[PDB]
Amino acid sequence: EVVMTQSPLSLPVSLGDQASISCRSSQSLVHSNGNTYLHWYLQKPGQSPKLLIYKVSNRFSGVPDRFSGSGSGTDFTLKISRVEAEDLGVYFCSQSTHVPPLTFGAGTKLELKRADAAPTVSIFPPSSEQLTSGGASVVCFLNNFYPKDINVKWKIDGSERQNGVLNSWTDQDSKDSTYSMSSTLTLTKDEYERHNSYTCEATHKTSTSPIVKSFNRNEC
Amino acid sequence: EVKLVESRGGLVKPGGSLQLSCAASGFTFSGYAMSWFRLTPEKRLEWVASIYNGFRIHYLDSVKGRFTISSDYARNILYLQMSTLRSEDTAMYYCSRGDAYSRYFDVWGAGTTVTVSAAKTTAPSVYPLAPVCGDTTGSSVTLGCLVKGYFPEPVTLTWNSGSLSSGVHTFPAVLQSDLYTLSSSVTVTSSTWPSQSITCNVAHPASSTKVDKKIEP
Ligand SMILES: N[C@]1(C(=O)c2ccccc2)[C@@H]2CC[C@@H](C2)[C@H]1c1ccccc1
Numbered sequence: 510e511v512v513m514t515q516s517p518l519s520l521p522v523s524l525g526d527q528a529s530i531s532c533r534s535s536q537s538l539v540h541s542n543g544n545t546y547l548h549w550y551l552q553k554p555g556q557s558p559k560l561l562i563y564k565v566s567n568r569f570s571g572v573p574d575r576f577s578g579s580g581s582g583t584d585f586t587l588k589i590s591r592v593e594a595e596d597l598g599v600y601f602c603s604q605s606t607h608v609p610p611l612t613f614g615a616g617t618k619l620e621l622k623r624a625d626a627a628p629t630v631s632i633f634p635p636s637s638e639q640l641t642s643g644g645a646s647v648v649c650f651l652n653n654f655y656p657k658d659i660n661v662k663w664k665i666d667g668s669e670r671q672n673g674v675l676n677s678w679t680d681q682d683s684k685d686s687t688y689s690m691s692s693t694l695t696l697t698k699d700e701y702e703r704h705n706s707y708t709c710e711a712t713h714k715t716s717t718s719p720i721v722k723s724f725n726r727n728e729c
Numbered sequence: 730e731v732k733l734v735e736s737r738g739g740l741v742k743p744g745g746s747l748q749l750s751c752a753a754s755g756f757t758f759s760g761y762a763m764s765w766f767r768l769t770p771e772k773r774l775e776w777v778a779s780i781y782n783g784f785r786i787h788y789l790d791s792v793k794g795r796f797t798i799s800s801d802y803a804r805n806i807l808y809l810q811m812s813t814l815r816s817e818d819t820a821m822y823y824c825s826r827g828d829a830y831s832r833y834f835d836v837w838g839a840g841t842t843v844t845v846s847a848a849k850t851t852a853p854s855v856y857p858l859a860p861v862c863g864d865t866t867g868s869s870v871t872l873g874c875l876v877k878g879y880f881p882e883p884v885t886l887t888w889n890s891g892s893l894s895s896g897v898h899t900f901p902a903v904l905q906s907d908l909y910t911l912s913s914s915v916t917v918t919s920s921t922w923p924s925q926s927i928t929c930n931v932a933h934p935a936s937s938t939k940v941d942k943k944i945e946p
């Protein structure tokens with residue numbers, strides 16, 4: 510199995526900018542027949558993959574000339590001369606020289622750049638309704654931040670809590686280009702009533718120290 | 730035009746079986762390496778299998794002995810018989826025609842959802858998320874809605890029956906205890922709430938349920 514490594518995993522650009530995506534294989538993709546079966550595909554949300562470039566540098570019919578491919582052997586590059594909104598999505602390189610199996614890179618998400626933005630953090634205690642059912646989920650939203658990289662940490666009575674945390678992230682907002690995150694700490698009602706201080710902390714490049722939000726159960 | 734018409738996907742229990750198919754429209758399989766691919770929940774694009782001219786048949790290791798790819802070159806219909814289905818098989822499947830000469834895939838069928846789970850249809854519990862004391866202040870306030878323990882996807886969620894569309898963030902569902910859980914937040918000026926009402930509306934077609942939850946202090 511040939512492993513395809515793409516870099517970067519995320520490529521933020523501004524409309525009108527040039528974009529360059531790299532793909533490298535664990536072995537030369539030059540077939541014994543002389544051809545190099547390296548191709549580039551683009552997949553948008555809720556859509557099937559679309560062929561852009563085949564055999565390294567052959568642009569497929571209908572594909573704008575803004576896209577061009579190059580490279581040889583083990584290293585390849587997909588270039589976009591002038592990024593347009595329609596180009597946003599996930600780009601995958603694929604090799605079909607050494608098969609089976611056909612393999613693809615993990616993909617490079619082309620996204621938009623914008624000014625940095627600190628996340629707005631909000632914490633929420635378990636609801637009366639959920640508690641009546643025996644469950645206790647504490648929710649924390651980290652909204653409208655940029656860049657997309659962020660980390661959340663939960664603490665119960667001051668101590669770090671890793672178990673029972675589930676996270677979800679939105680795709681880049683189509684209107685303001687920011688990102689948002691939802692983190693939920695689920696415990697049993699029993700465990701929730703055993704402690705009192707609940708905290709969620711966000712670490713983001715817009716602050717040296719984490720943004721902290723907390724509450725005490727017995728206060729509601 | 731030229732396209733691939735995909736069949737419906739489906740929900741199956743582990744160890745179960747299911748067959749997907751795609752009909753050619755505007756072309757013939759003759760000369761092409763008809764194949765199946767899948768986008769996993771983790772968002773990785775994987776090749777599953779291919780069949781070229783009846784005998785050149787190939788499979789991804791993980792599915793050898795469970796999935797069978799076949800083709801009706803007379804009717805021009807591609808099949809993927811999935812048996813001994815595992816949870817890891819859950820994904821969006823696509824059929825595509827591969828050029829045997831250049832080895833690329835130009836025509837693709839629309840994605841077909843296949844879910845492997847033991848779960849049974851379950852309506853979600855909708856919990857209101859009210860701000861903690863001392864945070865209902867500020868120029869703006871954020872309210873939330875937790876939609877927990879439903880199956881299968883999806884659910885549709887709105888705020889104030891759609892009147893509140895701006896400042897909303899409804900997150901992708903995640904699995905936990907084999908059931909889905911999703912959340913949504915809405916931010917409004919501190920003036921609006923609580924004096925004015927804010928309600929979370931959740932529809933789950935699979936169970937014919939529609940739940941509304943008012944966010945109260
Ligand atoms: N070996 C082939 C095949 O069917 C194939 C398909 C998938 C995996 C391994 C092999 C046949 C002969 C030339 C073409 C068609 C090639 C091929 C490779 C990769 C993609 C498309 C077609």
Ligand SMILES: [O-]
Nearest residue numbers: 781785786787
């Ligand atoms: O083959």
